[PDB]
Amino acid sequence: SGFRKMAFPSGKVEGCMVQVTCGTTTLNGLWLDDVVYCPRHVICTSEDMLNPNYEDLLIRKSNHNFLVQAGNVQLRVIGHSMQNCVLKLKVDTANPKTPKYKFVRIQPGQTFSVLACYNGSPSGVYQCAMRPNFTIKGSFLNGSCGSVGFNIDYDCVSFCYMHHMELPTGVHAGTDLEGNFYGPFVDRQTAQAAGTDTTITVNVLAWLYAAVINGDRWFLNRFTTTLNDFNLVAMKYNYEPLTQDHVDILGPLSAQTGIAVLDMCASLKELLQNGMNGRTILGSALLEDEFTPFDVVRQCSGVTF
Amino acid sequence: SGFRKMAFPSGKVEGCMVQVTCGTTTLNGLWLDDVVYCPRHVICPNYEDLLIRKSNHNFLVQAGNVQLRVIGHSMQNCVLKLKVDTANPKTPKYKFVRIQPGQTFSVLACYNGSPSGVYQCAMRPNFTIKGSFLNGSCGSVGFNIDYDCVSFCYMHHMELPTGVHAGTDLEGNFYGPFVDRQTAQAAGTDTTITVNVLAWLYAAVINGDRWFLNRFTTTLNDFNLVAMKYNYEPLTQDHVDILGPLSAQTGIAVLDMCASLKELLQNGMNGRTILGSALLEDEFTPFDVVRQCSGVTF
Numbered sequence: 124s125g126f127r128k129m130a131f132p133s134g135k136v137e138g139c140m141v142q143v144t145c146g147t148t149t150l151n152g153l154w155l156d157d158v159v160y161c162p163r164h165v166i167c168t169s170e171d172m173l174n175p176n177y178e179d180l181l182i183r184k185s186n187h188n189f190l191v192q193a194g195n196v197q198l199r200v201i202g203h204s205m206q207n208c209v210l211k212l213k214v215d216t217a218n219p220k221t222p223k224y225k226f227v228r229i230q231p232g233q234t235f236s237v238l239a240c241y242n243g244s245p246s247g248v249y250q251c252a253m254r255p256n257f258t259i260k261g262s263f264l265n266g267s268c269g270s271v272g273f274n275i276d277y278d279c280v281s282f283c284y285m286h287h288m289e290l291p292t293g294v295h296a297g298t299d300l301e302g303n304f305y306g307p308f309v310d311r312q313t314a315q316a317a318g319t320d321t322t323i324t325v326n327v328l329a330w331l332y333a334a335v336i337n338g339d340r341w342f343l344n345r346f347t348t349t350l351n352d353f354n355l356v357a358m359k360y361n362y363e364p365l366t367q368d369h370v371d372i373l374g375p376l377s378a379q380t381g382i383a384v385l386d387m388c389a390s391l392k393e394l395l396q397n398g399m400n401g402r403t404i405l406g407s408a409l410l411e412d413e414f415t416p417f418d419v420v421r422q423c424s425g426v427t428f
Numbered sequence: 429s430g431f432r433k434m435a436f437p438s439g440k441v442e443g444c445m446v447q448v449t450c451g452t453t454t455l456n457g458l459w460l461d462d463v464v465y466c467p468r469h470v471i472c473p474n475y476e477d478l479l480i481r482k483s484n485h486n487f488l489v490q491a492g493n494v495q496l497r498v499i500g501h502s503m504q505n506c507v508l509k510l511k512v513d514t515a516n517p518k519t520p521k522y523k524f525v526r527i528q529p530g531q532t533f534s535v536l537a538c539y540n541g542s543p544s545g546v547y548q549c550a551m552r553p554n555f556t557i558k559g560s561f562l563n564g565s566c567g568s569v570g571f572n573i574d575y576d577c578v579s580f581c582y583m584h585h586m587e588l589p590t591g592v593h594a595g596t597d598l599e600g601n602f603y604g605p606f607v608d609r610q611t612a613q614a615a616g617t618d619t620t621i622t623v624n625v626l627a628w629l630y631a632a633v634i635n636g637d638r639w640f641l642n643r644f645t646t647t648l649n650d651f652n653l654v655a656m657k658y659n660y661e662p663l664t665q666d667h668v669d670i671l672g673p674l675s676a677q678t679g680i681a682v683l684d685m686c687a688s689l690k691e692l693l694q695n696g697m698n699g700r701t702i703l704g705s706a707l708l709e710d711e712f713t714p715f716d717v718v719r720q721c722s723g724v725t726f
């Protein structure tokens with residue numbers, strides 16, 4: 124029993140964190156085999172950030188301008204290249220702690236663990252979700268750039284995010300490990316603002332199924348809804364449209380609890396209308412949207428209470 | 429910016445997790461140097477009588493794909509200590525520490541000696557933890573990290589009828605009035621950790637959430653009458669002293685923030701949130717707030 128925002132154990136990622144220094148800037152890098160991956164803005168001055176020409180800044184650099192530190196050991200840089208917004212530093216030593224890994228690009232609504240680091244030293248781990256507006260509500264201070272997001276299903280680490288910047292509203296933007304940004308963001312200090320965010324509907328439904336699994340049904344009702352009527356109502360509360368893909372994905376949780384997806388959709392409609400009335404669901408007074416259908420199945424028991 | 433329920437990096441603890449099997453029971457053990465620590469209920473009660481009938485070879489200890497050989501066994505309170513023939517080469521610098529209610533720690537939840545997740549939690553005033561554990565989680569541990577030293581503070585033993593969890597320190601002493609057996613046990617009425625709620629209100633102010641601030645101040649006596657009425661733990665002069673740094677950073681005196689908390693307790697939030705929460709959060713200590721708003725590394 125119980126339901127917590129759970130992160131993956133971070134050990135396999137901790138053994139990959141390094142410090143990258145270029146001039147006066149120090150940030151974090153990810154050391155996998157003989158390559159260190161880090162945000163390309165490590166080569167920028169603050170002035171450069173308004174309109175940086177990364178190709179022009181990079182051509183003026185040599186291997187010995189990049190200082191890479193792994194624990195108490197200095198790694199020697201023997202090559203460098205840029206791939207989109209990521210800098211790849213070839214080093215002379217392969218990481219003996221390199222786990223089994225993949226680079227995966229995730230979609231909005233997907234969750235992942237973040238290992239927040241400063242000076243190549245891990246400080247904490249937390250669970251989060253890629254928002255529909257492509258930002259993440261993280262907890263990052265200056266020096267956290269290069270910190271990574273990942274999932275660990277089985278013994279393989281799937282790296283999905285690398286931290287690049289904080290937006291004016293306090294939310295965070297970054298790239299996949301191939302250096303492609305999530306969202307319409309640029310690694311440039313321009314007027315960039317996150318689009319209006321929405322609630323991840325399929326995740327709220329998954330979390331309502333988790334509440335039923337743990338033994339709570341106060342919020343259920345005797346009604347059903349069509350998918351289109353559900354979407355016309357939920358969009359009035361800034362909820363993401365629920366697609367047939369989301370309904371198919373919720374199939375297993377529907378079969379486990381005996382509650383049809385569209386009947387759980389009717390319960391969500393009523394919750395949006397009435398609020399909780401002094402009650403909580405899994406110890407929360409808000410409808411939680413940072414647990415996916417996959418996270419609920421992984422964390423919850425296979426036997427409904 | 430941002431404020432998340434953050435756990436310590438779990439790597440140093442992952443390298444200590446093993447699987448302990450005794451008969452039909454499989455649970456988790458903590459391998460430090462040449463000793464494996466695990467709940468004594470793995471042998472299940474008259475624990476001395478059950479233990480005397482066991483030999484070293486009855487305990488199967490598995491570390492990854494390797495079987496460790498048990499060469500000795502002893503009991504210390506509610507913890508079983510299995511002497512093994514191999515010292516853990518991944519043993520970090522560590523201490524066994526007993527924590528107090530209100531203090532927080534990270535839990536590495538394990539099943540079959542394999543870590544599955546990490547989360548942050550607090551020892552409730554009623555000595556239970558609101559964790560997330562299924563069958564097979566027994567022996568999972570709670571810890572904090574200071575510099576490079578792991579301080580182990582909790583080992584999971586059982587789930588109570590309300591879905592909350594109970595366990596011991598690493599010396600086998602239970603937190604709370606609990607016993608390790610299948611019997612009628614209930615957690616006492618819980619209370620809110622007042623000093624932690626105040627720390628979280630200071631974290632909100634540091635992050636730009638100031639709507640709850642007011643011009644008023646109060647006294648410890650007046651506030652404690654309000655806290656007692658709303659099932660909040662009493663606030664002591666020690667708690668006020670501990671909140672000193674956050675008070676100096678934000679310019680809001682502790683009894684000034686207490687007057688804000690009193691108004692939140694008597695009027696609610698009025699459709700508003702604080703750090704994305706509609707409830708007053710009590711699982712961040714004053715130290716956790718200072719650490720997350722400073723970036724301390726290990």
Ligand SMILES: O=C(Nc1cncc2cc(F)ccc12)[C@]12C[C@H](C1)Oc1ccc(Cl)cc12
Nearest residue numbers: 164172263264265267287288289310311429
């Ligand atoms: O946003 C940035 N760094 C921060 C990342 N996360 C949390 C932060 C919290 C802070 F209070 C400050 C900077 C943060 C900065 C560092 C300065 C701005 O130059 C930059 C150049 C390029 C890019 Cl894409 C980003 C940045």
Ligand SMILES: O=C(Nc1cncc2cc(F)ccc12)[C@]12C[C@H](C1)Oc1ccc(Cl)cc12
Nearest residue numbers: 124469561562563565585586587608609610
């Ligand atoms: O409480 C227990 N185990 C569980 C620990 N955590 C989460 C659990 C979640 C569950 F759904 C079931 C058992 C859990 C049990 C195993 C049965 C009861 O015999 C016991 C004897 C002594 C002790 Cl201290 C504990 C137990």
Ligand SMILES: [Cl-]
Nearest residue numbers: 228229230233
């Ligand atoms: Cl995805």
